[PDB]
Amino acid sequence: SIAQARKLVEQLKMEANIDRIKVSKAAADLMAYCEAHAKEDPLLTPVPASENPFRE
Amino acid sequence: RNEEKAQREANKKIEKQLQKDKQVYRATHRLLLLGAGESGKSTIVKQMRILHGIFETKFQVDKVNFHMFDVGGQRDERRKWIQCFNDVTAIIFVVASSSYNMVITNRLQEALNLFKSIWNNRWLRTISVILFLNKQDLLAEKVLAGKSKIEDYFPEFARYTTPEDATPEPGEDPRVTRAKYFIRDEFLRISTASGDGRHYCYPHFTCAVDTENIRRVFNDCRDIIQRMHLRQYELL
Amino acid sequence: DEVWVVGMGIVMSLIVLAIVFGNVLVITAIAKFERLQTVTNYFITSLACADLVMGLAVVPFGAAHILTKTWTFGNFWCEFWTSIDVLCVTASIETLCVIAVDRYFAITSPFKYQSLLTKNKARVIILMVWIVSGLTSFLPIQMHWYRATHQEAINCYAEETCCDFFTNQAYAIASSIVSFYVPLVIMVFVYSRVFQEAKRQLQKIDKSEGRFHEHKALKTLGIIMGTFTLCWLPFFIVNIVHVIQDNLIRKEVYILLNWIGYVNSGFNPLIYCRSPDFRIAFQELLC
Amino acid sequence: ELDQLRQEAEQLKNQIRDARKACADATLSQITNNIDPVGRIQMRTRRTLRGHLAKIYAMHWGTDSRLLVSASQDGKLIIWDSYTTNKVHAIPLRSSWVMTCAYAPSGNYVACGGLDNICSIYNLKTVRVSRELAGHTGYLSCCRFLDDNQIVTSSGDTTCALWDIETGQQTTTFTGHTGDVMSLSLAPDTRLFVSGACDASAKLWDVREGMCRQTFTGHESDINAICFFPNGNAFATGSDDATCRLFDLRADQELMTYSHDNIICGITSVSFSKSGRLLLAGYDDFNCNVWDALKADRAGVLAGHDNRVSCLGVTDDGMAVATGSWDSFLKIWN
Numbered sequence: 071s072i073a074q075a076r077k078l079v080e081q082l083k084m085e086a087n088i089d090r091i092k093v094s095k096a097a098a099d100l101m102a103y104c105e106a107h108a109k110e111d112p113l114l115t116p117v118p119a120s121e122n123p124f125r126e
Numbered sequence: 127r128n129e130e131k132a133q134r135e136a137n138k139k140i141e142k143q144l145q146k147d148k149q150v151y152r153a154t155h156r157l158l159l160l161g162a163g164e165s166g167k168s169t170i171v172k173q174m175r176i177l178h179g180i181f182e183t184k185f186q187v188d189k190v191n192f193h194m195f196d197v198g199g200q201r202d203e204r205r206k207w208i209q210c211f212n213d214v215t216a217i218i219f220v221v222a223s224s225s226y227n228m229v230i231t232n233r234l235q236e237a238l239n240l241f242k243s244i245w246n247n248r249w250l251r252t253i254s255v256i257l258f259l260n261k262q263d264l265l266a267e268k269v270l271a272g273k274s275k276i277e278d279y280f281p282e283f284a285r286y287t288t289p290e291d292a293t294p295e296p297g298e299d300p301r302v303t304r305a306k307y308f309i310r311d312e313f314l315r316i317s318t319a320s321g322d323g324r325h326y327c328y329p330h331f332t333c334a335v336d337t338e339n340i341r342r343v344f345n346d347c348r349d350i351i352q353r354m355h356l357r358q359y360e361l362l
Numbered sequence: 363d364e365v366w367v368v369g370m371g372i373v374m375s376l377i378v379l380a381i382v383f384g385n386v387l388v389i390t391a392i393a394k395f396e397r398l399q400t401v402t403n404y405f406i407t408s409l410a411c412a413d414l415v416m417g418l419a420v421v422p423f424g425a426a427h428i429l430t431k432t433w434t435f436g437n438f439w440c441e442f443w444t445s446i447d448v449l450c451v452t453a454s455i456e457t458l459c460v461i462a463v464d465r466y467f468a469i470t471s472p473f474k475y476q477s478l479l480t481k482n483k484a485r486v487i488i489l490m491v492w493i494v495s496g497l498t499s500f501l502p503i504q505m506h507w508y509r510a511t512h513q514e515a516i517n518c519y520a521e522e523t524c525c526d527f528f529t530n531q532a533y534a535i536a537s538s539i540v541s542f543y544v545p546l547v548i549m550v551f552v553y554s555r556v557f558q559e560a561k562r563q564l565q566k567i568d569k570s571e572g573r574f575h576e577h578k579a580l581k582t583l584g585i586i587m588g589t590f591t592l593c594w595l596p597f598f599i600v601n602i603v604h605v606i607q608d609n610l611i612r613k614e615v616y617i618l619l620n621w622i623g624y625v626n627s628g629f630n631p632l633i634y635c636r637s638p639d640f641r642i643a644f645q646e647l648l649c
Numbered sequence: 650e651l652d653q654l655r656q657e658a659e660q661l662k663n664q665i666r667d668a669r670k671a672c673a674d675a676t677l678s679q680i681t682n683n684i685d686p687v688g689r690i691q692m693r694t695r696r697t698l699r700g701h702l703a704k705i706y707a708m709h710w711g712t713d714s715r716l717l718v719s720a721s722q723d724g725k726l727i728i729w730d731s732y733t734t735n736k737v738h739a740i741p742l743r744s745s746w747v748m749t750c751a752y753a754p755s756g757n758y759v760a761c762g763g764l765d766n767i768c769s770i771y772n773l774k775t776v777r778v779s780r781e782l783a784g785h786t787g788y789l790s791c792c793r794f795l796d797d798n799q800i801v802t803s804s805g806d807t808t809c810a811l812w813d814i815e816t817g818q819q820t821t822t823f824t825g826h827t828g829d830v831m832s833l834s835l836a837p838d839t840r841l842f843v844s845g846a847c848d849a850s851a852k853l854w855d856v857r858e859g860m861c862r863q864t865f866t867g868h869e870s871d872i873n874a875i876c877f878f879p880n881g882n883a884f885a886t887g888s889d890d891a892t893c894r895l896f897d898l899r900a901d902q903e904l905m906t907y908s909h910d911n912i913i914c915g916i917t918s919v920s921f922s923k924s925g926r927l928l929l930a931g932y933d934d935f936n937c938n939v940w941d942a943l944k945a946d947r948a949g950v951l952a953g954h955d956n957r958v959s960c961l962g963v964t965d966d967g968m969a970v971a972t973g974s975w976d977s978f979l980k981i982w983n
């Protein structure tokens with residue numbers, strides 16, 4: 071079971087060398103995507119009953 | 127046009143099949159068999175088996191269909207496979223009553239902890255438990271002129287006395303009766319602590335030779351269903 | 363004088379309103395929610411429907427007849443009113459008998475309850491009960507087989523403003539036997555068996571576990587047998603006695619006991635709908 | 650020397666935590682504060698599907714947003730038709746316990762598994778068993794069709810695998826989890842997938858490389874469900890402590906948490922919308938809740954089920970949302 075321990079160390083070593091970006095840029099990207107695709111969400115915007123397939 | 131008729135015909139056939147299957151679904155009764163390791167769970171099923179990742183066993187008693195589902199191959203200290211068993215009629219618990227000396231901690235203490243965890247589970251609040259206390263004659267041999275004593279492993283035995291309502295089997299010394307009733311009361315204390323009147327326990331004493339295990343289970347299931355019906359109408 | 367006639371209208375209207383409201387609330391609560399759609403709940407639905415029909419049909423007309431002291435409708439309408447009374451009264455008891463039998467089967471036959479009772483069979487039973495109840499009301503009242511023979515009855519029949527209850531011995535015995543006496547022994551036997559089973563189970567539990575750890579059975583059985591017995595017992599005795607020998611029971615006592623029988627209508631929802639699911643349903647709407 | 654290795658591991662965790670903390674320039678709520686809220690949202694039931702004799706655990710919408718599949722504990726899979734609320738198929742099972750179901754992207758194959766450690770696949774158009782995949786040592790929890798000729802599965806033995814339908818033999822096995830794995834989700838491009846284990850940890854895997862890339866340990870209890878952002882650079886998880894957290898692949902830490910003080914029940918399902926603005930999560934309180942992704946503000950409640958909700962899904966076109974409950978009823982909300 072001690073043999074296991076070196077394998078863990080390699081995994082943490084490989085998972086620590088990752089380039090990261092500031093959270094502000096990621097929040098801005100999420101904001102931009104949500105704003106851009108905000109006009110094509112039937113759940114968000116109540117569509118007229120003419121195009122609604124579940125209106126009986 | 128004909129597509130609607132074809133879909134209606136398919137729906138009618140499916141409804142007929144479901145209506146046919148509903149009766150056989152409601153007819154059968156489902157039981158769960160859980161035990162700790164070294165219990166004897168395996169020996170008990172085959173005698174029941176000899177008579178009429180998972181294991182299923184079918185046996186009919188007085189034109190009533192019972193189905194038993196051993197869960198095995200998944201040894202988990204934490205069980206998440208237990209949320210699926212809230213609709214079973216009863217739970218069969220098998221414990222090795224003669225193994226209080228065997229050290230893994232103790233086996234009997236581990237079985238008691240498992241029973242306590244099962245009893246207080248959130249999804250099993252309305253499920254009764256049938257208890258089988260296996261290995262009767264091993265316990266008798268250990269108690270009668272045995273070097274090992276219950277006093278060393280279980281200290282509160284010392285203050286325990288034989289109940290006045292006990293009915294000891296003929297031809298046995300008082301010592302084995304005391305040990306058996308002490309273990310049964312040890313289980314019944316946890317059974318009673320949080321009973322709340324919704325589900326009970328049915329202790330029993332058995333051995334490899336006994337063939338009455340089939341009749342007992344039937345009687346206990348009938349009693350459980352009758353008690354549930356009585357409580358539903360506010361009569362108990 | 364006027365003040366005394368002035369008073370009973372308020373209480374009679376309150377009785378009518380309570381009778382209507384209770385059964386309409388039970389009916390809408392059962393219909394609205396799909397979780398209460400149970401086999402044992404169909405008999406209660408039939409009972410509520412019959413009780414609501416009776417409370418909306420016979421009670422106001424009897425109130426108007428008592429207050430006005432003169433029947434201002436036609437003879438056909440009075441006969442229809444009497445038929446409605448007989449039909450509803452007969453149908454309001456056999457449903458209780460069916461409920462008692464269903465509980466007996468559920469408790470004493472736990473392994474065969476599911477197979478014996480089916481949603482299709484309950485409808486057949488309900489229609490059979492309703493058709494036998496309507497066979498003993500409309501069929502012998504539209505025809506003149508119930509009519510008496512003495513001169514007072516004929517004089518009242520001739521007049522278009524008088525219609526009381528006059529009948530011979532045969533109908534007065536047959537209707538009572540069909541409506542009340544027969545569905546009584548069955549209920550008594552069923553509830554005695556249920557009480558015996560409950561006592562046996564309680565004794566078994568006490569013997570098995572009582573060291574670490576009656577009043578309940580009696581109370582439920584009691585609030586069930588006594589309400590119905592006290593409500594419907596005296597009337598179905600005076601019905602026989604005043605016919606078996608005349609000049610014993612005055613009209614006032616007969617009417618008073620008959621109206622005492624009607625008060626049983628407002629108690630069935632308070633007895634058969636006390637389950638926690640019903641409380642949740644009642645709290646869900648109009649609360 | 651084991652203690653020295655443990656010391657080296659302890660040191661690495663601190664460096665990773667410091668690196669994650671160094672990137673916390675500003676909170677998500679601070680950035681998204683001037684956006685007008687979407688306001689209250691209201692939904693009403695449009696269809697109700699009946700025919701299941703027992704409780705329902707899983708369901709999966711079709712690729713055409715018309716058909717759907719559902720599996721119950723009576724031992725049956727039923728393929729519905731939401732437009733005409735009528736059934737098309739009813740497949741019996743050898744084992745009556747099923748915990749997951751899936752629908753092929755091409756609409757040709759259907760798979761399901763349960764307590765028995767076997768994943769079975771049915772050919773819809775030929776309905777008989779086509780292939781049985783075995784080799785797992787624990788109960789299956791979730792499975793998803795990566796394509797028409799290969800499937801990815803997770804089981805209760807702390808592993809995930811990528812099967813091959815034609816051969817029936819395991820191709821790549823992912824290890825590293827400590828507790829049972831209950832859910833997984835795939836990226837739209839089918840290059841990476843995430844898994845949520847019972848040790849309060851979520852990981853990001855590589856299908857082709859067969860190695861782990863990142864590890865997220867935001868939660869403190871069991872993780873039951875997981876969903877993936879439409880953009881492809883975020884995902885959300887739901888745990889037993891009545892909390893939902895939105896993580897981030899590029900930032901490598903959580904950004905927002907969803908919780909309220911009046912709920913103490915568990916969470917069983919999580920899903921997004923087409924635009925990603927709405928977070929839909931099912932609870933153990935017999936109903937559903939609709940959150941706001943960029944504001945953590947409640948915007949609606951989906952009630953109508955008499956028992957706990959154990960399934961949730963949104964169609965590809967995003968026109969309706971369907972929920973499953975232990976009351977043996979399926980509902981369509983719009």
Ligand SMILES: Nc1nc2c(ncn2[C@@H]2O[C@H](COP(=O)(O)OP(=O)(O)OP(=O)(O)O)[C@@H](O)[C@H]2O)c(=O)[nH]1
Pocket residue numbers: 161162163164165166167168169170260261262263264332333334335
């Ligand atoms: N004296 C006695 N010995 C028994 C009895 N039942 C079983 N044994 C013995 O104890 C053993 C334990 O039962 P097993 O056959 O191992 O059953 P199992 O299902 O593998 O046991 P678990 O590990 O508890 O799941 C049996 O194989 C027998 O050797 C019994 O009634 N009396």
Ligand SMILES: CN[C@@H]1CCc2c(ccc(O)c2O)[C@H]1O
Pocket residue numbers: 447448451452527534537538541601620
């Ligand atoms: C005057 N009203 C009637 C009189 C006779 C009668 C009633 C009810 C049930 C019966 O079996 C009867 O015979 C009463 O409702």
